[model samples]
Target: LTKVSSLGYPRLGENREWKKLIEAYWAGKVSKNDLFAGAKELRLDFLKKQLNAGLDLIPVGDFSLYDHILDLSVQFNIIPKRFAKEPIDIDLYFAIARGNKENVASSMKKWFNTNYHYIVPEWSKQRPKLNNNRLLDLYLEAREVVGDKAKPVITGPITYVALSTGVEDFTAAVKSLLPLYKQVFTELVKAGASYIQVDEPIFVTDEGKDYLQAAKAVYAYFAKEVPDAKFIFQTYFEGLIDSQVLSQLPVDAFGLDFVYGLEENLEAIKTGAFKGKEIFAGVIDGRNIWSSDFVKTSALLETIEEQSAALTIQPSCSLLHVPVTTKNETDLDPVLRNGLAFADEKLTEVKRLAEHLDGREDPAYDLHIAHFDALQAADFRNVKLEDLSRVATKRPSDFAKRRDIQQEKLHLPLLPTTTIGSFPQDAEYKQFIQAEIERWIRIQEDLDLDVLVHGEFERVDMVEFFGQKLAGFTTTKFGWVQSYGSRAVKPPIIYGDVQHLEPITVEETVYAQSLTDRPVKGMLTGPITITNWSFERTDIPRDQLFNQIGLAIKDEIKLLENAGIAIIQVDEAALREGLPLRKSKQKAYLDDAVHAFHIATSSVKDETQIHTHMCYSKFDEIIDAIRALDADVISILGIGLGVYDIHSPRVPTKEEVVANIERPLRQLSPTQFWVNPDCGLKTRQEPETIAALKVLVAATKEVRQK
Candidate 1:
């Protein structure tokens, strides 16, 4: 019989217990064992919930105190032999998660092209041993609760090895781990798990081809040695570019994302790519809040069944990327809030799909279907689109002239020291914003800086704050999507046409300016950011949606300018994130993204310097596009990944900070650049951030003197 399963599930739990427990453990309020206990209880309930939903394969062992990759590092003891002397203690492990003055954090990079980042594991010349007993512990623990029917999920050795660091020949490293994986597989089978889902979602990347060969070799070993234990290799984020190669894998099942790659994968399946592999078609949308249209979803399932008799259905990716459920959002407009499924709702959707396919007409599916139908007929398409093609790089003079005049007028030095428009986000400030409006008064007096802000303690998300003020937007309390390990963000919903009736940040900027004789940088989340962060409108054109947002922000910028707020910082951190996945489509995205940014800040007088900040990864590729934003001052290098020791000893050395700034500076005309970190320093420790700042300060002095 065909069986439904997950590649793995989200581990954050309903209330984000993973985050709370991890934070508690880091703060020393709770012991490691206490954190583990919380995780264990959540894991059991998570499994029980799946079982209750009538899931055939109950995925286990995906929960981690930090990251699953880090878990694998600990399990394999893959410490650099140099660090082996240091011995990775639990406290040291926690230290790596939360950086300190002495110790540096591990390198972080985007996880499979998504916003989530995983801490990279450093490897040694000699690979460490992998223990199978830990693998058996989870399987046996799950079996103790579920009784001989549990299915465990483990990150596939090839994917784990590929996502990990310290390998010249990744395939060779993957092969070496097979003996260890085989031991685990053999033990897990003995522990009573009938099947296992091995996640290898990196198959979507161009570099993942090397690991696909490793997958084939590894799965072949499992098929021959552990035939009784079924294996499902999962791929998501992007479609398998080479599905024919996947057909040769000796695995029992293959899962494909039907959410993002539906059109692409449907064409691939119609071509009859996977001949004999049991197709675990991910039919439910797991990454977003839009209710799954059952008629469309079921029809897509029929397409999968047509290509392969052995078919199972599940969510496109882990539901951890969306909120838990929408039970508490009673304040949302009735028309806008219909039939939307967060992760919990997705579980019920999965059950309905399973029951329907099983020939049982599940009556509960009707309520959702009817609710969606009722809301579908609203006249959402008649809104007028704003025309912004007139906005251009056409200023009174070139960027150099504006920069020279502004720099002399402002009378500042080269590499000027300034923040990315924020000072600190402390508890008093947060409570002041939440409970008392008057807290802004004290915050203004305490802050000592050249550029001033309202101190954003009250605001949670930068983009969501505006969305809350604007009409035609809705928000959720628990819309926690995993942006990185244990760091989740509730992506604001842009359901209807987004337009601004009144000013968004003018009052805050005005107040901040009143407090300080120093320039108050008016903070606004740019159109590119709002467009990138929200679940955008399907009915509205991309150009139309952004221009409307552009116009609204343009109004806010003008208001700040009129209020005599001379400095403004419009952050476009999501600008690059909003770029199209494929390289070919990046230009159009960059064009619109850059245009939206420039139009918002261009209306301000040339004397008013516009500052923008970006976060992790290199920005040299987009330096030309960034310059197009036409901001007078740009802050780059907020936090270097320390991926390969990029930044060290604070921007302490003039040479070091100059080296960091050279590439970005070379791309910009002298007038258009101001040196700062990619983002704010509040997330950083005092000593480390100060060290980085001092280096930057010295480097700025050195450059200006030259």
Candidate 2:
């Protein structure tokens, strides 16, 4: 009665082989031919995994070298104006992502509401055409592995055009990309493909409405041109606001989210709008790490089946948001482990749901249900829980007054130079932690920088480091998801109530401060970032969870303050990353976020001088958001907004840093400006790091003189 499909799978392979291959390609350790060969191997391997998972329709074009969007953009000749003359090859492709010797890279932004980012396509003056059918190539490639089970996946033109920038005319961009899409669809259809997943998840937002009129016209065109292609028009994150307009669009199936958008979408089906049309009802949540509630999902599926002519079950969104597997997570408690599901485990849930829906039964269903029930009564939660209402939300003094006091106390210079809490790391670093700290302090003294960091030598990751010491968090061994190109993160699970047991970074900071007369920054990831980064518990309210994490961070702040660490930096690097996409819903989110941040920082004394680091693509918009954050010193990746590529190993020139630094000075008060790179230097090698910092210090000296 029902078929199971995957919206998409994680590109970061089980052991992160995909990340390693891409990184090795970038490092020139592997040849371009070998890179393609390796990628094909990983791609086919993923397709095989999904087949083994029992997915009826596995998405083919979802696999990407850098990003799926970027792949389509390049394949459609939607290359940015900057790379117009460059040849279409592997280096050119990467050059567009990470800048080359001459030009800066394309802009990168959040992939809708998710933490994963994508390269923004530039809608240049010339209209885009189908350069080559990359989707068709990928579809053919995938079919070789799993045969006809491969379903071609593509970003719907309406959604791609909506997310893109520099569009002088939106309707025209949609019109230009239509013929290209028709060619793609017709080829996929002729190549024995029955279904194509045209992802248009942007329709889940308010901006979706702006493109609705165009969507009707685009699909209408596709109906006539690519009549043989059975399209599954997919939407996720939330239910479509105007299901009426979407319902009228001529498509084979409607892929609606039955999880997040269950309230609105489920009602749309009950009203008999998609009565005759095939409904790919997304029952399992793709974003979360928890096991599915079979009882609840069964009820939802029965209702959806009663309305639609045909039903296909799948995840609410792509399993890209989750890690690979929980099988390798041997350290977790058996009770908690039974309640967990990563990407691989999720596929089994999909199979079990489809089997149960089709009148088959499995004991695993009841076992999963029993595990879910037992997880509620487990002792893993609430180590030292306390009241959330008693939390502080503001300091005694404001930023202006605090700044005056802080400058008088610390004695800093104009355009003060510093690193973003970390330096280039070395191996065998645990015993060498103190040695590395002492050496870095001496290096900073020679560099003559104003503020110093403890070099973050003992830290592997910002969130993971503290999560190891915190009471309510659990770290995974092989749980990794792609954050960006060649970057993967293993986000810890906040399974219970959070509490601070002992000092996290006091000893490191105190030691660094002892050696250097220069003020050392006590770096801590803010409550908002920790919560945003971790796979948070669903049993509690988000605000309550935030307050819990906030209070725990406040406890750490008190320890730092008592230990005489005057300059404490609570890094909210993901502040903009966690921001809600819609303008109408932003106010509430911003208020809650700022309140959580205050809960972390407000308890400290006025002279402690809180600093926050936010690296956003759109820096202009952030000025409005950070106003209420009220930290005395704020460091941002303002320089990376347009000037330079900090992600590359190539060192920044003094002139480039001066130009990059000066652009922000026009918008900033000169007295309040702090000069630094947009992020940590841990990724860069020692030689490159020293050169970059030396250039930064020299550039800041000149900027101050100016």
Candidate 3:
């Protein structure tokens, strides 16, 4: 029989029990111990699901209440001197992931190419000492649940060391952590883990070679020091790019990424250093929910098996990225349902693949293949040519006239720092926005406001909610990917042609307008963001796919304009982040990406006031592209927060933001400009959000002096 198992599962419980638990703990609705019990139960249940899967190797120590990175930090006792005094328990742990909301926490950054985020590991030379094998204790507890047969998975030492920031001497720091890893490995073996899966994903990254060298040293030490523990080093996200460095290692097993590794990856592994290693070939694509083509997977596995001592089949990466399963989606269109499989469905794929290899012929496998065939047969050809109604695309009257009228009407201010268009997103925020709407109505009754927006609470995520309403999209249960540590989000899954079937935000805007005569802004997630947040098609260039989504949003844009929503915020928060990571591919992506935004918004007339919100993190590189989108008002996350929070205390003085706007201000002449943070204020405290806005509006008033 073949062994099939996931490296880790998503910890966010159904109906988001963790989201509730964390929210409740913060609200004081539950006690500290209550939160601990909830989290502990979550971890236990996650293990039980794997155990119930009946696999020989179920992972322990991989489950985390928040992020695995943070868990590792706590386990290793690598608390930086800065946060050392802070209470470090389950509650405090999650609090650190998401700041206390009352105070600032450590900086947040992206986790590689994927949206998943990690806690920024602070590694100061003077910081507290390291205690690495803390994960072993969790492993021991998990082993007790699954008996001695259970396997334990650990993040490779190289990955653990590389993801750390605020550090000096990378190699030296990693080397320093070696003894701890050896100790950890030895402890796991002694505690009954027969096989240990060391995830060294960075081995396929640009530093793949350097990481492999580290892997060699680490694995060599493990081989010599802990002979009883079998070492299985898994590399994914890309292929085994560094065969030479790995050839020198004493590793016994390797997990190869077949999805991203594609067809070339299989050949790359066959020729090189993997002479006798057990190959856990990643045949199923786990990052996406598209149904796996089992016939093709079976053929690929057959080819790989001939060249390997032992070939185990599995998903290319963790199924944590996909939804839990299709079981809950009873109302889904049967046609659409056939072509997709979330995380749980993917698990069935793994089991079926194992069964197929075991010579068990199942008709369900053939049925799934036929479903793919039936899905492909449908003629969605007409959808490609559907015209977005022209009247909806027309902008408000003349641009020049509206700009002067808007300036005079609001009694104008320069560098006005409003927000990207949200007040606090907490439960209290609903009332905050409702009250703001009422206040705006009264204010508009007596006076005109220059840069205006109706506070939006009607959105879960800028991209996700739209994807939920649009056709040809699906959602994952465990598909939670990180954006920045503790600030995790489950982005939408755009599987096919996304067409806006009807008006999305019309009612909300209309409702707000009815409450007060003030114009209620129509907020929208831009096409670029909607597409970028999803794992889109690799079959077509991303630009083409983005354009398709752009067309869909363009339809909505016209509808909002036609409904007479004067100022509409089309948020492209992911616009700059939408660029390709490699510099070589940047310009082309920016051109099409920015052009897609322009085509969507520009379809409308000028006075409609197209406001675009880019992320507050990085506008420097894509500033020119953002300028090209030519929105009337450019609202960002925090005042002087730049395109993204550069994490500099050097928050933009009101003068700096206006100055930055002035340069781009000259380029998009006929259109007026406004500046603010890229996203919402839910993460920030009310005081900070208000303080930043006060600085921003004051600065804009100063600019009006000119």
Q: Name the best candidate (by TM-score).
A: 2
lDDT of 1 by residue, 532-599 (tens): 77766644467767767777777777777888877777776675567666555678877876766766
Candidate 2: count the clashes.
Answer: 0
Q: Model 1: which residue pairs collide?
A: 637-678, 638-677, 638-678, 651-692, 651-695, 652-695
TM-score of every candidate:
0.84, 0.86, 0.80
lDDT by residue (tens digit), candidate 3, 16-110? 67767767877789898898788788878777776776556776766666677877776666655556666766655665666665644555556
Give me the overall lDDT of model 1. 0.68
Please report, as a residue range, the 10-residue window in candidate 1 with the lowest summed lDDT: 637-646
Number of clashes in every candidate structure? 6, 0, 29
Q: After aligning candidate 1 to the native by TM-score, how far in Å is the CA of 251 from where it should be?
A: 2.1
Lowest-sum lDDT 10-residue window in model 2: 637-646
Query: What overall lDDT goes with each candidate model?
Result: 0.68, 0.83, 0.66
Which pairs of residues collide in candidate 2? none
lDDT of 2 by residue, 448-542 (tens): 88889989988888898999999889988999988777777888998877889999999899999999888899999976678778998877777
Q: lDDT of model 2 at residue 202?
A: 81
